Amino acid sequence: EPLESQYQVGPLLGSGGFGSVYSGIRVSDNLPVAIKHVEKDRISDWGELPNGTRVPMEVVLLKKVSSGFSGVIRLLDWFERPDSFVLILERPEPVQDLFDFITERGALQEELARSFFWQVLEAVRHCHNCGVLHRDIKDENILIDLNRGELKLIDFGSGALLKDTVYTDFDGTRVYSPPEWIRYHRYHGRSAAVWSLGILLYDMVCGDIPFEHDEEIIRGQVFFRQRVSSECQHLIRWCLALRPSDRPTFEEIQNHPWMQDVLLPQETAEIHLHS
Numbered sequence: 431e432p433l434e435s436q437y438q439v440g441p442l443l444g445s446g447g448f449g450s451v452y453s454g455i456r457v458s459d460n461l462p463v464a465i466k467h468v469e470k471d472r473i474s475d476w477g478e479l480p481n482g483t484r485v486p487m488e489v490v491l492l493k494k495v496s497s498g499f500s501g502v503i504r505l506l507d508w509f510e511r512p513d514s515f516v517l518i519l520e521r522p523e524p525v526q527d528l529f530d531f532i533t534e535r536g537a538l539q540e541e542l543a544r545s546f547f548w549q550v551l552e553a554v555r556h557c558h559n560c561g562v563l564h565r566d567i568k569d570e571n572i573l574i575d576l577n578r579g580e581l582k583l584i585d586f587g588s589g590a591l592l593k594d595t596v597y598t599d600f601d602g603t604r605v606y607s608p609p610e611w612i613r614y615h616r617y618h619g620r621s622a623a624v625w626s627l628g629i630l631l632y633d634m635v636c637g638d639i640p641f642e643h644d645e646e647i648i649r650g651q652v653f654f655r656q657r658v659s660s661e662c663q664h665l666i667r668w669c670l671a672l673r674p675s676d677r678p679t680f681e682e683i684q685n686h687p688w689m690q691d692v693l694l695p696q697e698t699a700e701i702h703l704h705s
């Protein structure tokens with residue numbers, strides 16, 4: 431029933447502002463897992479389970495979206511400790527985050543970016559449909575199940591319940607944050623998500639993010655350092671509209687002509703990954 435009984439701990443996979451994440455194995459069936467530790471002091475956002483249990487928001491959010499859809503990393507279990515929480519997540523194998531994948535490969539071919547970006551959109555739509563706002567969409571928070579060509583969202587530790595009124599708090603990644611946050615410390619959920627998705631898509635097809643400093647975010651002028659089709663450039667600049675209400679809805683993104691004829695995930699692994 432206790433934690434270090436149920437799970438054999440492997441090596442540290444990474445650590446940072448989000449806590450420390452370890453490789454692990456469930457002792458019962460040898461299922462691969464990832465084990466995330468977060469100190470209570472560094473959790474600012476605390477939700478409630480139906481049954482009134484105080485927990486990090488992250489646990490609330492992952493329970494809200496943890497089902498059969500494989501586009502979000504599944505929370506398998508969690509534990510409170512006197513000074514920390516521990517989360518057990520599913521772990522694909524082999525696996526690589528999108529940041530490392532892009533660092534290795536450089537700018538992605540458009541066919542590949544289309545497939546990946548499409549899966550990210552399906553995953554984010556599912557979160558929103560379940561009342562969950564991720565608030566830190568970026569290559570480091572997206573993982574690739576290399577054998578299946580399937581992407582998964584991870585790290586809901588900066589997320590929130592989706593609402594229709596203004597957010598005035600933010601602790602996600604600043605270079606993916608929209609100009610209205612930089613200037614006014616205010617944003618609305620969906621349109622801020624769409625801006626981060628513009629940053630991500632640019633990142634995929636150029637191999638780096640378009641803006642580094644506040645003043646570039648605010649100016650919002652996009653320069654393409656690699657050859658990118660006119661239709662892709664158009665979608666990117668739409669997502670990155672300075673006025674939030676000028677940005678496309680998710681439906682508009684998925685109906686964009688650059689988004690048509692997406693590869694299936696398995697086709698994507700065969701053409702682009704196993705190779």
Ligand SMILES: C[C@H]1CN(c2ccncc2NC(=O)c2ccc(F)c(-c3c(F)cccc3F)n2)C[C@@H](N)[C@@H]1O
Nearest residue numbers: 443444448451464519520521522525527570573584585
């Ligand atoms: C090591 C990963 C940890 N990661 C996270 C940051 C904040 N919260 C959670 C995570 N990771 C996970 O929740 C998770 C769940 C299942 C996984 F399979 C992985 C994972 C892994 F187990 C190996 C390589 C990468 C992964 F994302 N991470 C950031 C990635 N930039 C890094 O890479």
